């Protein structure tokens, strides 16, 4: 959630990949409460270019 707050704050200049369909980067950060919907860029920073 802490990571999500910033990633949804600047989702225009820096697009990342949210791991599931059903939510996007501009989804409200409070919804990131399941373990499966952690973004893969956050689980491994080498995926973010």
User: Given the complex with other proteins, which of 24 and 47 has the nearer CB atom?
Assistant: 24
DSSP assigned state of 15:
-
Q: What is the nearest approach in angstroms of other proteins to the Cβ of residue 6?
A: 8
Q: What is the nearest approach in angstroms of other proteins to the Cβ of residue 28?
A: 8
Q: Is 45 in the site for other proteins (CB under 8 A)?
A: no
Distance CA 27, CA 44 (A): 21
- Which alpha helices (DSSP H) does 1-49 contain, by range? 2-7, 40-43
Token pair, residue 39, equals 């973004």
Contacts to other proteins by CB under 8 A: 6, 10-15, 21-27
């Amino acid at each position: 959630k802490v990571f999500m707050a910033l990633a949804n704050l600047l989702a225009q200049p820096e697009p990342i990949a949210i791991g599931v369909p059903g939510m996007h980067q501009t989804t409200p950060a409070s919804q990131f409460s399941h373990p499966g919907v952690w973004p893969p860029g956050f689980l491994n920073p080498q995926l973010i270019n």
